[PDB]
């Protein structure tokens, strides 16, 4: 029973970035957090000493999974996850609102 997986479009209900929607680049289960595309912009330093040119690049800092919710392919609204077995004889996770299959 897991919540968020890599590649899905998700919504944020909490924080400075709350309300924005975006795909997930990477999911780490060690620190329990997710990374949303083009979200929570922070400064990163990649320098070049020989070329004398330092380069500062924006990057997406990992966000807590509790502040992030999945988006249903049909309803398009943010919703909680539920585990069900469809009539096709499959084990799947679907929205608590509609019957659309998330996977």
Partner 1 sequence: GLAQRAERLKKNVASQLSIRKIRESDPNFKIKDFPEKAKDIFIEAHLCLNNSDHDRLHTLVTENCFPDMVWDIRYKTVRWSFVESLEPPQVVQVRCSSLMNQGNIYGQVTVRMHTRQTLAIYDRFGRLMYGQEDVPRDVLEYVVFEKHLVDPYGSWRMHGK
Query: Residues interacting with partner 1, by CB under 8 A?
Result: 20-22, 37-39, 41, 43, 54-58
The token duo for 6 is 């890599």
Structure tokens at 103: 């996977």
Which CB, 56 or 88, lies closer to partner 1? 56
Smallest distance, Å, CB 37 to partner 1? 7
Nearer to partner 1, 44 or 84 (CB): 44
DSSP of 17-58 = TTT-EEEEEEEETTTTEEEETT-SEEEEEEE-STT--EEEEE
The two structure tokens encoding residue 83: 């585990």
CB of 72 to partner 1, least distance (A): 17
> Toward partner 1, which CB reaches closer, 23 or 93?
23
């Amino acid at each position: 029973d897991w919540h968020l997986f890599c590649g899905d479009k998700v919504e944020i209900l909490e924080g400075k970035d709350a309300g924005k929607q975006g795909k997930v680049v990477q999911v780490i289960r060690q620190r329990n957090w997710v990374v949303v595309e083009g979200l929570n912009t922070h400064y990163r330093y990649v320098g070049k000493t020989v070329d004398y040119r330092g380069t500062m690049i924006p990057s997406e800092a990992p966000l807590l999974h509790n502040q992030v919710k999945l988006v249903d392919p049909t309803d398009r609204k943010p919703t909680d996850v539920e585990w069900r077995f469809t009539e096709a004889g499959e084990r799947v996770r679907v929205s608590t609102r509609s019957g659309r299959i998330i996977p």
